[PDB]
Each structure stands twice: as C-alpha cells, then as structure tokens.
C-alpha cells in the first residue's frame, strides 16, 4: 500500500514574557516517530519509535539544529503577522505548518505538500505542482512575494520529491517489522434494545493499523446510510486504531442488516451479521 | 528527516 | 480568532473486563485554539496520573490530543472525561460507557 512522511509544527505566542510554545512532531504513516517540545528539559529532537533509535548522533544533531531554527522562524513570524494584521501585543496567536510527501505502493513519489496557517485559518500553501503558492489574503500575498524572490518553492520541491522520499524509504525499511505490517481490524457486533420496537446494532473494528478504514451498512443487500451513526476513528494508545458504525433497526428485523469492513490488512470481503 | 536548513520567514 | 469546540470520546484501549487492568482514554479533537484542560475522573474525582500525546492537528488545522491513564474497571466504579476550553461556557463531562 501507500505511505507518507509528514511533519507538524505549532507555535503559540506568550505575549507577556518569553518565546513561543513550540511543538513539533513527525509521522511515518500513522506512527509518530520524533518530537520536539520547547517546554521539555532536553531541548533535543527526541525519538518516539524504536526503529528511529538506529540513527546516530549526527542525525540527532542535524534534526535538533533544524527544529530549533524552525522555532526561531516562527518566533519572528508571529511578530511579522501581528503587524500585517494590526493586532495588539496583548493576545496569544498561533502559527501552524505541515509538510510532507506521499508515495504509492511502489514507494515512488506521488505528491508533496507544504501548508501554513495563522490563527487556524489558511494563510499560504504550495500548489500541487510544487512550483507556485496559494495565498489566501493580502498579508499572505506579501509573504508569497518574499518567498518567490527568495526561490523557496524550488528548495521545497527538491526536498519533497527527493529527500523526503528517500528518508521515507529508509524508515520503512529500517522499521519494516511494524511499519510494513498491516493489522487487520478485529470485528464484532453488539445489539442494544431501546424499546420493544427499536434496537441498535453496532459494528466494531478494533486493533487495526493503518488508521484508514471503511465501515458500511447494507439492508437486504442495498447501501443504508439513513439511521446510521459512525464515530471518528480513534487511537487506542498502543499504536492501533478503533472505529464503530451503528444502525437503528425495527426489533425482530436484525437479520436484514449487514456490516461491511474494508481495510488494507483484509485481502477479502469482511461481512458481519447479527445471527446471534 | 526534516526540510532544512530553516524555513524562510513569512 | 476562529474558535472550534472539542469533540470528545471516552473509551478503553482494550476490551473492558471488570477486574482486569486496562487503559482509559479521552480523545479530544476538532478544536482551536490549542489551550485545553482535560481531566479523567474516577467516581467524580480527578485522577492524578494522566499523560497525554504530543499536540498535532488535522488538515483543517484543528488540534487533537489523547489523554490516558491506567485503570481497572469494576461493576460499581464510574469513569468520565471532563473538558474545558475557551469555547465552552462550563466544563463538559462525558461518562465512560463500555458500549461506546
């Protein structure tokens, strides 16, 4: 299947005193592998998966240098944007950045992205061809002109199409035992009576990896989206994910209803029914 | 690994 | 400032079986800004040893965190997640229900 490497950065100003709170995290697919937190004691990029602990001191030194520099870019940015937006010195504000690369099943480059936000709104993002920028408003257009004059897109494009992919491939190999393993959902159904005439059937998917999953209900073999509820996929806390989908049915008609589960770890159709 | 050396300022 | 209120789910890491150790999770997502106060409660009292994930966010910029602690469920003990955020007038409590 397909794979991705993504980095996420959040800076939040502390206008009364000191530098922003800065939190950076990196993922391969749905696995967090590194972190930096400005409030933590180490002031180093830190490992969060066993397979990145292979990397030597050079790696940790380079990743720390880069993340610290990034934190200072956001320090300055929070000032600059305050000014672009004519905002006072009193309030806290937020800069977010995410970037990364997707690759296909052949592990070749598919697409890259680099998006930036101020106070949770779109600000500037690299277009899909990695050669120009989408600026949402006039402040961001000022940023776009700066980044065009300094040839930022060209640097980023070379990272996203090359370096990002190469490191992604290194990680998938080095962490193969987990990163290339798929964990199929563990499924079951439960039944819950509301009244004498209505029941809920809930279809459960537990302990799966990666997080991408589809749960669907049919009634007599036809798609049923009416009277359904689907919770957001959620992390279990041990690296795997969970989801359920429910349907409300007339009690006594449960056998008409089937839950269908698609996931990368399933080679074949999974269907569940309440025969119990 | 991260994009480096340092993102350009906004 | 865009303000977005947190969605909350409260649930166990593993299937819940009375008498057997486990982990209680409170997953908060969809919120902005990032300042949030999340507590796990046992029979209405704050649990002291609660850890959380490192802050991250969705493509729509909204944040998400996982708060978690060890626990051993029983028939009679009640568990809940209490959240406060600038969008909430009063704290929001979601009870842990083992069917959800």
Short mmCIF file of C-alpha atoms in Angstrom, two decimals:
data_model
loop_
_atom_site.label_atom_id
_atom_site.label_comp_id
_atom_site.label_asym_id
_atom_site.label_seq_id
_atom_site.Cartn_x
_atom_site.Cartn_y
_atom_site.Cartn_z
CA UNK A 1 0.00 0.00 0.00
CA UNK A 2 0.70 3.70 0.02
CA UNK A 3 2.78 5.57 2.55
CA UNK A 4 3.63 9.06 3.75
CA UNK A 5 6.05 11.10 5.88
CA UNK A 6 4.61 14.23 7.50
CA UNK A 7 5.85 16.83 9.90
CA UNK A 8 3.62 19.07 12.00
CA UNK A 9 4.64 22.28 13.77
CA UNK A 10 2.67 24.50 16.18
CA UNK A 11 3.87 27.75 17.73
CA UNK A 12 1.73 29.72 20.22
CA UNK A 13 2.85 33.16 21.35
CA UNK A 14 3.28 34.08 25.01
CA UNK A 15 2.95 37.84 24.79
CA UNK A 16 3.67 38.65 28.49
CA UNK A 17 7.09 37.04 28.60
CA UNK A 18 9.48 34.88 26.58
CA UNK A 19 9.42 32.85 23.39
CA UNK A 20 6.51 30.87 21.91
CA UNK A 21 5.48 27.38 22.98
CA UNK A 22 6.68 25.21 20.09
CA UNK A 23 5.73 21.59 19.47
CA UNK A 24 6.92 19.59 16.51
CA UNK A 25 6.01 16.04 15.63
CA UNK A 26 6.94 13.71 12.77
CA UNK A 27 4.99 10.75 11.45
CA UNK A 28 5.55 7.87 9.09
CA UNK A 29 2.03 6.79 8.01
CA UNK A 30 0.08 6.70 11.29
CA UNK A 31 3.19 6.20 13.52
CA UNK A 32 4.70 9.16 15.40
CA UNK A 33 8.49 8.82 15.31
CA UNK A 34 10.06 12.06 16.57
CA UNK A 35 9.08 15.02 18.71
CA UNK A 36 10.35 18.35 19.99
CA UNK A 37 8.66 20.35 22.76
CA UNK A 38 10.12 23.71 23.73
CA UNK A 39 8.86 23.22 27.37
CA UNK A 40 10.73 19.87 27.76
CA UNK A 41 14.14 19.73 29.51
CA UNK A 42 16.31 18.12 26.78
CA UNK A 43 15.93 20.79 24.10
CA UNK A 44 16.63 17.94 21.61
CA UNK A 45 14.61 16.27 18.89
CA UNK A 46 13.63 13.04 20.66
CA UNK A 47 12.82 9.53 19.35
CA UNK A 48 9.27 8.17 19.77
CA UNK A 49 9.59 4.84 17.89
CA UNK A 50 12.16 2.11 18.37
CA UNK A 51 13.28 1.96 14.77
CA UNK A 52 14.47 5.62 14.68
CA UNK A 53 16.80 4.88 17.64
CA UNK A 54 19.10 3.23 14.98
CA UNK A 55 20.09 6.72 13.82
CA UNK A 56 23.37 8.04 15.14
CA UNK A 57 24.38 11.23 16.89
CA UNK A 58 24.84 13.07 13.54
CA UNK A 59 21.14 12.55 12.84
CA UNK A 60 20.00 13.79 16.25
CA UNK A 61 22.34 16.80 16.00
CA UNK A 62 21.00 17.72 12.48
CA UNK A 63 17.35 17.22 13.43
CA UNK A 64 17.79 19.35 16.58
CA UNK A 65 19.53 22.15 14.59
CA UNK A 66 16.74 22.22 12.03
CA UNK A 67 13.87 22.16 14.54
CA UNK A 68 15.45 24.90 16.69
CA UNK A 69 15.98 27.10 13.62
CA UNK A 70 12.33 26.48 12.66
CA UNK A 71 11.16 27.52 16.15
CA UNK A 72 13.00 30.84 15.73
CA UNK A 73 11.47 31.37 12.28
CA UNK A 74 8.04 31.08 13.95
CA UNK A 75 9.12 33.48 16.73
CA UNK A 76 9.85 36.05 14.09
CA UNK A 77 6.78 35.18 12.05
CA UNK A 78 4.42 35.71 14.98
CA UNK A 79 5.78 39.30 15.17
CA UNK A 80 5.55 39.86 11.46
CA UNK A 81 1.97 38.56 11.22
CA UNK A 82 0.84 40.53 14.30
CA UNK A 83 1.93 43.57 12.30
CA UNK A 84 0.39 42.51 8.97
CA UNK A 85 -2.92 42.04 10.80
CA UNK A 86 -2.63 45.22 13.00
CA UNK A 87 -3.05 43.22 16.10
CA UNK A 88 -2.13 44.32 19.62
CA UNK A 89 0.57 42.89 21.84
CA UNK A 90 -1.97 41.53 24.31
CA UNK A 91 -3.29 38.31 22.76
CA UNK A 92 -1.87 34.94 22.06
CA UNK A 93 -1.67 33.82 18.41
CA UNK A 94 -0.89 30.60 16.61
CA UNK A 95 1.25 29.62 13.66
CA UNK A 96 0.85 26.07 12.22
CA UNK A 97 2.89 24.41 9.42
CA UNK A 98 2.59 20.94 7.94
CA UNK A 99 4.62 19.43 5.15
CA UNK A 100 5.44 16.07 3.67
CA UNK A 101 5.39 13.52 0.90
CA UNK A 102 3.13 10.66 -0.21
CA UNK A 103 4.39 7.65 -2.12
CA UNK A 104 2.44 4.81 -3.77
CA UNK A 105 2.70 1.07 -3.31
CA UNK A 106 5.94 1.19 -5.41
CA UNK A 107 7.32 3.73 -2.92
CA UNK A 108 7.79 6.31 -5.70
CA UNK A 109 6.82 9.91 -5.24
CA UNK A 110 3.11 10.61 -5.69
CA UNK A 111 2.62 14.09 -4.25
CA UNK A 112 4.04 16.64 -1.88
CA UNK A 113 2.53 19.43 0.23
CA UNK A 114 3.53 22.36 2.42
CA UNK A 115 0.76 24.32 4.14
CA UNK A 116 0.93 27.23 6.66
CA UNK A 117 -1.85 28.79 8.88
CA UNK A 118 -2.24 31.77 11.17
CA UNK A 119 -4.90 31.56 13.96
CA UNK A 120 -6.32 28.39 12.43
CA UNK A 121 -7.08 29.95 9.06
CA UNK A 122 -5.46 29.18 5.72
CA UNK A 123 -2.55 31.58 5.05
CA UNK A 124 -0.20 30.20 2.35
CA UNK A 125 0.19 26.75 0.80
CA UNK A 126 2.30 25.27 -2.00
CA UNK A 127 0.21 24.30 -5.06
CA UNK A 128 0.14 20.66 -6.18
CA UNK A 129 2.85 21.15 -8.80
CA UNK A 130 5.21 22.47 -6.11
CA UNK A 131 6.11 25.47 -8.26
CA UNK A 132 3.84 28.32 -7.05
CA UNK A 133 1.84 29.41 -3.98
CA UNK A 134 -1.81 29.88 -2.97
CA UNK A 135 -2.06 32.99 -0.75
CA UNK A 136 -5.48 33.44 0.89
CA UNK A 137 -5.41 37.17 1.65
CA UNK A 138 -3.27 40.27 1.18
CA UNK A 139 -0.98 39.57 4.12
CA UNK A 140 -0.22 36.12 2.75
CA UNK A 141 0.33 37.71 -0.71
CA UNK A 142 3.10 39.80 0.88
CA UNK A 143 4.61 36.52 2.20
CA UNK A 144 4.19 34.92 -1.28
CA UNK A 145 6.17 37.74 -2.91
CA UNK A 146 9.00 37.27 -0.32
CA UNK A 147 9.11 33.51 -0.87
CA UNK A 148 9.06 33.95 -4.69
CA UNK A 149 12.00 36.38 -4.55
CA UNK A 150 13.98 34.02 -2.32
CA UNK A 151 13.16 30.92 -4.52
CA UNK A 152 11.63 28.99 -1.61
CA UNK A 153 9.40 26.74 -3.79
CA UNK A 154 12.42 25.44 -5.70
CA UNK A 155 14.14 24.32 -2.42
CA UNK A 156 10.99 22.77 -1.12
CA UNK A 157 10.22 20.98 -4.31
CA UNK A 158 13.69 19.39 -4.29
CA UNK A 159 13.11 18.24 -0.66
CA UNK A 160 9.57 16.94 -1.25
CA UNK A 161 10.33 14.99 -4.47
CA UNK A 162 13.74 13.74 -3.41
CA UNK A 163 14.97 13.93 0.16
CA UNK A 164 11.57 13.35 1.78
CA UNK A 165 11.02 10.23 -0.34
CA UNK A 166 14.49 8.87 0.27
CA UNK A 167 14.21 9.19 4.04
CA UNK A 168 10.70 7.74 3.96
CA UNK A 169 12.11 4.67 2.15
CA UNK A 170 14.91 4.36 4.74
CA UNK A 171 12.45 4.41 7.59
CA UNK A 172 10.08 1.88 6.02
CA UNK A 173 12.98 -0.48 5.62
CA UNK A 174 14.57 0.06 8.96
CA UNK A 175 11.19 -0.20 10.72
CA UNK A 176 9.79 -2.93 8.49
CA UNK A 177 8.74 -5.26 11.32
CA UNK A 178 5.98 -2.74 12.27
CA UNK A 179 5.86 -0.12 9.56
CA UNK A 180 5.32 -2.67 6.75
CA UNK A 181 2.95 -4.83 8.82
CA UNK A 182 -0.78 -4.38 8.43
CA UNK A 183 -3.01 -5.22 11.42
CA UNK A 184 -6.49 -6.20 10.19
CA UNK A 185 -9.44 -4.99 12.20
CA UNK A 186 -10.79 -7.26 14.86
CA UNK A 187 -14.53 -7.09 14.34
CA UNK A 188 -17.72 -7.96 16.17
CA UNK A 189 -21.32 -6.76 16.51
CA UNK A 190 -23.34 -5.87 19.56
CA UNK A 191 -27.04 -5.38 19.99
CA UNK A 192 -28.84 -2.82 22.15
CA UNK A 193 -32.58 -2.61 22.69
CA UNK A 194 -34.10 0.92 23.11
CA UNK A 195 -37.71 -0.11 23.42
CA UNK A 196 -39.84 -3.08 22.40
CA UNK A 197 -39.89 -1.91 18.74
CA UNK A 198 -36.37 -0.42 18.13
CA UNK A 199 -32.85 -1.82 18.50
CA UNK A 200 -29.35 -0.59 17.69
CA UNK A 201 -26.80 -2.80 16.04
CA UNK A 202 -23.21 -1.62 16.50
CA UNK A 203 -20.39 -2.89 14.29
CA UNK A 204 -16.94 -2.68 15.93
CA UNK A 205 -13.43 -2.53 14.43
CA UNK A 206 -10.57 -2.76 16.94
CA UNK A 207 -6.76 -3.05 16.92
CA UNK A 208 -6.17 -2.06 13.28
CA UNK A 209 -3.25 -0.36 11.53
CA UNK A 210 -3.09 1.75 9.42
CA UNK A 211 -5.94 4.03 10.55
CA UNK A 212 -7.67 4.22 7.09
CA UNK A 213 -10.82 2.03 7.28
CA UNK A 214 -14.36 1.92 5.74
CA UNK A 215 -17.40 0.68 7.65
CA UNK A 216 -20.75 0.49 5.84
CA UNK A 217 -24.24 -0.87 6.47
CA UNK A 218 -26.49 -2.59 3.98
CA UNK A 219 -30.18 -3.56 4.28
CA UNK A 220 -31.23 -6.51 2.16
CA UNK A 221 -28.03 -6.00 0.19
CA UNK A 222 -28.55 -2.26 -0.52
CA UNK A 223 -26.48 0.58 0.99
CA UNK A 224 -28.05 2.03 4.12
CA UNK A 225 -26.88 5.47 5.37
CA UNK A 226 -30.12 6.62 6.87
CA UNK A 227 -30.41 5.94 10.65
CA UNK A 228 -26.66 5.32 10.89
CA UNK A 229 -24.01 6.78 13.17
CA UNK A 230 -20.26 6.47 12.52
CA UNK A 231 -17.76 7.68 15.20
CA UNK A 232 -14.44 9.33 14.25
CA UNK A 233 -11.57 6.79 14.04
CA UNK A 234 -9.75 6.99 17.31
CA UNK A 235 -6.36 5.92 18.65
CA UNK A 236 -6.22 3.01 21.06
CA UNK A 237 -2.98 4.23 22.66
CA UNK A 238 -0.86 1.14 21.68
CA UNK A 239 -0.30 2.24 18.10
CA UNK A 240 -3.54 0.81 16.71
CA UNK A 241 -6.92 2.37 15.86
CA UNK A 242 -10.65 1.76 16.64
CA UNK A 243 -13.95 2.69 14.99
CA UNK A 244 -17.61 1.72 15.16
CA UNK A 245 -20.69 2.16 12.95
CA UNK A 246 -24.24 1.74 14.23
CA UNK A 247 -27.65 1.39 12.60
CA UNK A 248 -31.09 1.64 14.18
CA UNK A 249 -33.45 -1.17 13.16
CA UNK A 250 -37.00 -2.41 13.87
CA UNK A 251 -36.59 -5.08 16.51
CA UNK A 252 -37.00 -8.53 15.00
CA UNK A 253 -35.57 -7.41 11.59
CA UNK A 254 -31.90 -7.58 12.53
CA UNK A 255 -31.09 -10.29 10.00
CA UNK A 256 -31.68 -7.93 7.05
CA UNK A 257 -28.73 -5.83 8.10
CA UNK A 258 -25.08 -6.41 7.25
CA UNK A 259 -21.91 -4.51 8.25
CA UNK A 260 -19.13 -4.36 5.64
CA UNK A 261 -15.49 -3.71 6.53
CA UNK A 262 -12.69 -2.65 4.16
CA UNK A 263 -9.11 -2.32 5.28
CA UNK A 264 -5.64 -2.76 3.78
CA UNK A 265 -4.99 -5.74 6.11
CA UNK A 266 -8.02 -7.64 4.70
CA UNK A 267 -7.40 -9.48 1.47
CA UNK A 268 -11.03 -10.42 1.10
CA UNK A 269 -14.52 -9.20 1.91
CA UNK A 270 -15.49 -8.96 5.53
CA UNK A 271 -19.16 -9.00 6.30
CA UNK A 272 -20.84 -9.17 9.68
CA UNK A 273 -24.43 -10.08 10.54
CA UNK A 274 -26.47 -10.40 13.73
CA UNK A 275 -27.41 -14.01 13.72
CA UNK A 276 -26.57 -14.19 17.44
CA UNK B 1 14.23 13.88 8.28
CA UNK B 2 13.11 17.48 8.23
CA UNK B 3 13.30 20.01 5.50
CA UNK B 4 16.32 22.19 6.18
CA UNK B 5 18.25 24.21 6.87
CA UNK B 6 15.50 26.63 8.06
CA UNK B 7 12.21 27.71 6.57
CA UNK B 8 12.11 31.17 5.12
CA UNK B 9 10.48 33.83 7.30
CA UNK B 10 6.96 34.94 6.44
CA UNK C 1 -9.81 34.25 16.00
CA UNK C 2 -11.54 31.14 14.79
CA UNK C 3 -12.83 29.13 17.75
CA UNK C 4 -13.79 25.47 17.36
CA UNK C 5 -15.19 23.40 20.17
CA UNK C 6 -13.64 19.98 21.06
CA UNK C 7 -15.33 16.66 20.14
CA UNK C 8 -14.79 14.13 22.92
CA UNK C 9 -14.70 10.35 23.02
CA UNK C 10 -14.07 8.33 26.22
CA UNK C 11 -13.18 4.64 25.88
CA UNK C 12 -10.77 1.82 26.91
CA UNK C 13 -7.61 0.87 24.98
CA UNK C 14 -8.51 -2.86 25.24
CA UNK C 15 -11.94 -4.59 25.73
CA UNK C 16 -13.24 -3.73 29.10
CA UNK C 17 -13.45 -6.60 31.57
CA UNK C 18 -14.20 -5.99 35.18
CA UNK C 19 -11.27 -6.84 37.46
CA UNK C 20 -8.70 -6.75 34.68
CA UNK C 21 -6.17 -3.98 34.07
CA UNK C 22 -6.57 -1.68 31.11
CA UNK C 23 -6.14 1.97 29.98
CA UNK C 24 -8.81 4.71 29.95
CA UNK C 25 -8.60 7.19 27.13
CA UNK C 26 -10.10 10.62 26.46
CA UNK C 27 -9.61 11.66 22.85
CA UNK C 28 -10.28 15.35 22.17
CA UNK C 29 -10.27 16.62 18.57
CA UNK C 30 -11.57 19.25 16.19
CA UNK C 31 -10.64 22.19 18.44
CA UNK C 32 -8.99 25.58 18.16
CA UNK C 33 -7.10 27.25 19.75
CA UNK C 34 -4.80 24.65 21.36
CA UNK C 35 -5.17 25.66 25.08
CA UNK C 36 -7.38 22.95 26.70
CA UNK C 37 -7.87 21.38 30.13
CA UNK C 38 -8.69 17.68 30.14
CA UNK C 39 -9.18 15.53 33.25
CA UNK C 40 -10.04 11.84 33.74
CA UNK C 41 -12.36 11.28 36.62
CA UNK C 42 -12.95 8.29 38.91
CA UNK C 43 -16.26 8.47 40.79
CA UNK C 44 -16.16 12.19 40.21
CA UNK C 45 -12.59 12.84 41.47
CA UNK C 46 -9.69 13.87 39.28
CA UNK C 47 -7.18 11.11 38.57
CA UNK C 48 -3.64 12.38 39.20
CA UNK C 49 -1.53 10.26 36.89
CA UNK C 50 -2.73 11.27 33.44
CA UNK C 51 -0.44 11.55 30.45
CA UNK C 52 -1.16 12.94 27.00
CA UNK C 53 0.09 12.80 23.41
CA UNK C 54 2.02 15.46 21.71
CA UNK C 55 -0.08 18.14 20.10
CA UNK C 56 -0.86 17.60 16.43
CA UNK C 57 -3.63 18.73 14.04
CA UNK C 58 -5.78 17.75 11.03
CA UNK C 59 -5.58 19.13 7.53
CA UNK C 60 -8.31 21.59 8.54
CA UNK C 61 -5.94 22.95 11.23
CA UNK C 62 -7.96 21.71 14.18
CA UNK C 63 -5.99 20.11 17.03
CA UNK C 64 -6.19 16.67 18.59
CA UNK C 65 -4.84 15.06 21.76
CA UNK C 66 -5.11 11.73 23.54
CA UNK C 67 -5.23 11.75 27.34
CA UNK C 68 -4.79 8.39 29.04
CA UNK C 69 -4.17 6.58 32.31
CA UNK C 70 -4.05 3.04 33.61
CA UNK C 71 -7.29 1.70 35.13
CA UNK C 72 -9.01 -1.46 36.26
CA UNK C 73 -12.66 -1.29 35.62
CA UNK C 74 -15.29 -2.66 38.04
CA UNK C 75 -19.05 -3.02 38.22
CA UNK C 76 -19.51 -0.15 40.55
CA UNK C 77 -16.77 2.42 39.71
CA UNK C 78 -17.74 5.18 37.30
CA UNK C 79 -15.31 6.90 34.95
CA UNK C 80 -15.58 10.15 32.93
CA UNK C 81 -13.62 12.77 30.95
CA UNK C 82 -14.01 16.48 31.90
CA UNK C 83 -13.00 19.12 29.32
CA UNK C 84 -12.75 22.83 29.44
CA UNK C 85 -11.89 25.13 26.60
CA UNK C 86 -12.45 28.78 25.69
CA UNK C 87 -15.44 27.76 23.55
CA UNK C 88 -17.23 26.03 26.47
CA UNK C 89 -19.33 28.06 28.91
CA UNK C 90 -18.88 25.37 31.59
CA UNK C 91 -16.85 22.23 31.63
CA UNK C 92 -18.17 19.34 29.56
CA UNK C 93 -18.29 15.87 31.18
CA UNK C 94 -18.63 12.73 29.08
CA UNK C 95 -19.21 9.49 31.05
CA UNK C 96 -17.38 6.36 30.10
CA UNK C 97 -19.90 3.85 28.71
CA UNK C 98 -18.34 0.48 27.81
CA UNK C 99 -20.78 0.10 24.82
CA UNK C 100 -19.40 3.24 23.07
#
